[PDB]
Design a protein around this nucleic acid. Structure first.
Lengths: 411, 555
DNA sequence: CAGTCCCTGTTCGGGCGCCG
DNA sequence: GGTCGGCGCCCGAACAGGGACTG
């Protein structure tokens, strides 16, 4: 009996028309069950080939979760509806969320099924369930309510959400709540005990309105990975050559870095393994550059109107470094990940885990998902990445192949 | 006009475009008889209706001969209508494969008669579907009909039938869950583990459930006895194989005959193991006219004779047993060629295949092996929905060395080493630290964008030096040339210092094959070495001998 | 400095095969 | 014959975008 919020695509674009990719047996059986149930609850209804739109679909299990979850790759739809959830019904970003001692995430996707969708917009929510060995043609459906994973759903439900949260925001005003996609981010400076308690207070506060999860973050314990120079007491020709190249490369970030003296130590055509004493003018250009790497970059600040961009480097031995920026060499955040799931045995599982951890950090700090520059072949990524995905959102990405040059981010 | 029992699919034109008014081709008198005979019969059965001058649309029509019959088929050249009709989302996501079929106690195959003509078309659209039948006289005005079913030749008919067909089968599939009905267009593979008595009953239950909606299941196309003919195969209770493949035996080959040959060879490669088309597809590069005759090369005739000898012996595939694991094994057939077999019990192949795509100017056997693994993994999840266990001719240590050090992310699913030569290995390893007691070469090379001339050479810590004049070159080709010179003139162990990012990148990817002859020569000198260490230093910074050799190769 | 060019990788247009 | 849709492969030609040098 609820009135629908009328939605329209951004001007001059057609809906998504993306083909569905092959799916495993354990995922198709999971989708058939959920779709038959959602159809029985009126959340979806079957359609036909007159609808020229389609969006890929697959299923996942969150971290330490037995139950499957239906996931839709609405990235192509969200790109074609961007004006709605940013201009008309946008959500503010609490800049204090990143400062809390603990932040917990809650899957609130079930609440969107309570609200019907605009009738003229249901044409674009179309998807297809494939069959093993193509036994049957594609079983197609479309959404009758607010879909999970669409960027217009948390905007329409925002007015309803704020009214659900007011009795809890008034009781607990020092707590910060932010909503992104199908997730709810709740941060408090409470001790870890009474923090998890207030979570269950809100979990029961949400169950009485028609809605469960539990993933803990600690953004105050987030460290950045600076650029470091080795502390050798005996330097060789090769050590000094690698040092200059890394210092030459870093000069694009910190303009105050100079390498003249060090270069002077590489005047002669010397053997690489030959020990070279550092001149008095060299030992000082080495110490000043170490201090410039301590200083922050000049003129680096976040622009809300620019897209976030992330770069990831494989350092081997379970090490992965990353940088987040909007303009080149103006890194907003850097870091390093180690000993993630699949270390020393599965690069793709590690890269998948890293993209998630990075994207989660991007949501807490700026409320945006970055576009990723992934150090992997296109065909290798599109084959294995769904097997290790454990999140309800999907960022954008592209594929690069930059050979290593001079290990700038890891010793 | 009566109403069809099947629900209709609403269809629109693309916004802002009107129906087609195109005239009619001139038709031979033998086809005019075949059309008026078919037009007046379809008009009797309620499939086409006359239209007056109120229908301003028109589209051409013709008729081709059916294969191995005297009946003619009616086709419509809807090329102008298909342009202005709405886009459809096709539901046929792929083609079923017999390797994905599970052994069923009883199997039945049937095919409905005139499938497109048992399914209606949207009422509004019928008006658009207008065409003119020319008479035997060019002066007669002609008979104008409009379709009422799915016109064979229209772009929406296949998408509409498959969705309409599935909607009719859902009630029978919902009541009979253990009945496996492979539904591809008009053909129904029906299998069950019920006793053969309860099976023929369900067969007639569906032949009547299909009959309630206007779908006829003729006993002529009914198939109760093995071997069944399904999707171009032969299904026996324990094994299957493709229906016989016929290659051309031309004495003078054209380009189209190679295309027809390459096509059937690729089709044969799904069960017939070891088919190579490398030397036969090399006949298709850089050629312009299909109608152009091409003589076979000595490497191509040999590849054809081997493929003919393989097609002589009979081969057969098995069915999928979900209880036993899935296995896939790969061989390096030839340079740039790979073959594989998928099975569960040894030598009992579920299906075979080949992979030969050359990705990039610089590659190695490890990359190509990784690309083939992914091509098999995708193809597997399509047919069976799982990833097979892999038997790969690469040492576990060889692979561990590769992916741990490579800068991209890369991975292979659960696999095991199989000692089947030729084994895939890395032909050389770049040292991680500079070699103690090895000569150190500072190389560089440059050229002129206009003269296409350049120098390339080196300077060493022992005083050795060389500069070589070069012609017809680029900045990239020179910096590679400088490294080739250092390798030629150095001992078994050598340290090399360059400033070219372009070169270092090609080499750290440890390639064993390349489209450039200069890279191939660099590879051959690297294999002859025991230890090699590359390093990069920024240019124009006055570094070591890299500024004393940047000045000798300047012009 | 923007503007080429040298290089490499991807995408897509066009042939056959197969199925209905 | 010169109809449609699905899927595969092979090729070249067009697109595209990043690195080094120069106008």
């Amino acid at each position: 009996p609820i009135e629908t919020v009328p939605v329209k695509l951004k001007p001059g674009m057609d809906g998504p028309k993306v083909k569905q990719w092959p799916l495993t047996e354990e995922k198709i059986k999971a989708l058939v069950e959920i779709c038959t149930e959602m159809e029985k609850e009126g959340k979806i209804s079957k359609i036909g080939p007159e609808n020229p739109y389609n969006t890929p679909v697959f299923a996942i299990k969150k971290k330490d979760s037995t139950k499957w979850r239906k996931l839709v790759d609405f990235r192509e739809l969200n790109k074609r509806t961007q004006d709605f959830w940013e201009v008309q019904l946008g959500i503010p970003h609490p800049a204090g969320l990143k400062k809390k001692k603990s932040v917990t995430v809650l899957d609130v996707g079930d609440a969107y099924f309570s609200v019907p969708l605009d009738e003229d917009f249901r044409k674009y929510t179309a998807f297809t369930i494939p069959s093993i060995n193509n036994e049957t043609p594609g079983i197609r459906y479309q959404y009758n309510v607010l879909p999970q994973g669409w960027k217009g759903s948390p905007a329409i439900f925002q007015s309803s959400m704020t009214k659900i949260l007011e009795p809890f925001k008034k009781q607990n005003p020092d707590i910060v709540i932010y909503q992104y996609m199908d997730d709810l981010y709740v941060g408090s400076d409470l001790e870890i005990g009474q923090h998890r308690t207030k979570i269950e207070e809100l979990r029961q506060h949400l169950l009485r309105w028609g809605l469960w999860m539990g993933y803990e973050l600690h953004p105050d314990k987030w460290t950045v990975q600076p650029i470091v120079l080795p502390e050798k007491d005996s330097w060789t020709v090769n050590d000094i050559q690698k040092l200059v190249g890394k210092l030459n490369w870093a000069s694009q970030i910190y303009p105050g870095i100079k390498v003249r003296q060090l270069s002077k130590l590489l005047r002669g055509t010397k053997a690489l393994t030959e020990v070279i004493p550092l001149t008095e003018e060299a030992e000082l250009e080495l110490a000043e550059n170490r201090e410039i790497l301590k200083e922050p970059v000049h003129g680096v600040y976040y622009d809300p109107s620019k897209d976030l961009i992330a770069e990831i480097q494989k350092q081997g031995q379970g090490q992965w470094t990353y940088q987040i920026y909007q303009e080149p060499f103006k890194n907003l955040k850097t870091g390093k990940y180690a000993r993630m799931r699949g270390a020393h045995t599965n690069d793709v599982k590690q890269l998948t885990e890293a993209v998630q951890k990075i994207t989660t950090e991007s949501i807490v700090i700026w409320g945006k998902t970055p576009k990723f520059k992934l150090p992997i072949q296109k065909e290798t990524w599109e084959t294995w990445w769904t097997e290790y995905w454990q999140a309800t959102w999907i960022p954008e990405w592209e594929f690069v192949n930059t050979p290593p040059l001079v290990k700038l981010w890891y010793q | 006009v009566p109403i069809s029992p099947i629900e209709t699919v609403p269809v629109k034109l693309k916004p802002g475009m009107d129906g087609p008014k195109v005239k009619q081709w001139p038709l031979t008198e033998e086809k005019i008889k075949a059309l008026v005979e078919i037009c007046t019969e379809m008009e009797k059965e309620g499939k086409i209706s006359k239209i007056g001058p109120e229908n301003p649309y028109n589209t051409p029509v013709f008729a081709i001969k059916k294969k191995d019959s005297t009946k003619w088929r009616k086709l419509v050249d809807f090329r102008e209508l298909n342009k202005r009709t709405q886009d459809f989302w096709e539901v046929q996501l792929g083609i079923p494969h017999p390797a994905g079929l599970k052994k069923k106690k009883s199997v039945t195959v049937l095919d409905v008669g005139d499938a497109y003509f048992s399914v209606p078309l949207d009422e509004d659209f019928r008006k658009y579907t207008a065409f003119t039948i020319p008479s035997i006289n060019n002066e007669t005005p002609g008979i104008r009909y409009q379709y009422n079913v799915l016109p064979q030749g229209w772009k929406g008919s296949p998408a509409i039938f498959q969705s309409s067909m599935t909607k009719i089968l859902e009630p029978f599939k919902k009541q009979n869950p253990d009945i496996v009905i492979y539904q591809y267009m008009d053909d129904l593979y029906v299998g069950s583990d019920l006793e053969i008595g309860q099976h023929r009953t369900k067969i007639e239950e569906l032949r009547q459930h299909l009959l309630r909606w206007g779908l006829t299941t003729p006993d002529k196309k009914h198939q109760k006895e093995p071997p069944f003919l399904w999707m171009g195969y032969e299904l026996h209770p324990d094994k299957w194989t493709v229906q016989p493949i016929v290659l051309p035996e031309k004495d003078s080959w054209t380009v189209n005959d190679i295309c027809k040959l390459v096509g059937k060879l690729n089709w044969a490669s799904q069960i017939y193991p070891g088919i190579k088309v490398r030397q036969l597809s090399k006949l298709l590069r850089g050629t312009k006219a299909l109608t152009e005759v091409i003589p076979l090369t000595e490497e191509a005739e040999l590849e054809l004779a081997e493929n003919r000898e393989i097609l002589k012996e009979p081969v057969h595939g098995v069915y999928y047993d979900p209880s036993k694991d899935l296995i896939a094994e790969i061989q390096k057939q030839g340079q740039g060629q790979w073959t594989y077999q998928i099975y569960q019990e040894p030598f009992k192949n579920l299906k075979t295949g080949k992979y030969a795509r050359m990705r990039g100017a610089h590659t190695n056997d490890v990359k190509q092996l990784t690309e083939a693994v992914q091509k098999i993994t995708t193809e597997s999840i399509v047919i069976w929905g799982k990833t097979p266990k892999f038997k790969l001719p690469i040492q576990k240590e060889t692979w561990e060395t590769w992916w741990t050090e490579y800068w991209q992310a890369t991975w292979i699913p659960e696999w095991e080493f199989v000692n089947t030569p030729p084994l895939v290995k890395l032909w050389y390893q770049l040292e991680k630290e500079p070699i103690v007691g090895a000569e150190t070469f500072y190389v560089d090379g440059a050229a002129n964008r206009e003269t296409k001339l350049g120098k390339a050479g080196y300077v060493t810590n022992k005083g050795r030096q060389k500069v070589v004049p070069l012609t017809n070159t680029t900045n990239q080709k020179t910096e590679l040339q400088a490294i080739y010179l250092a390798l030629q003139d150095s001992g078994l162990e050598v340290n090399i210092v360059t400033n070219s990012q372009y070169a270092l990148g090609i080499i750290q990817a440890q390639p064993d094959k390349s489209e450039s002859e200069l890279v191939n020569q660099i590879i051959e000198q690297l294999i002859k070495k025991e230890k090699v260490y590359l390093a990069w230093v920024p240019a124009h910074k006055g570094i070591g001998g890299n500024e004393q050799v940047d000045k000798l190769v300047s012009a």
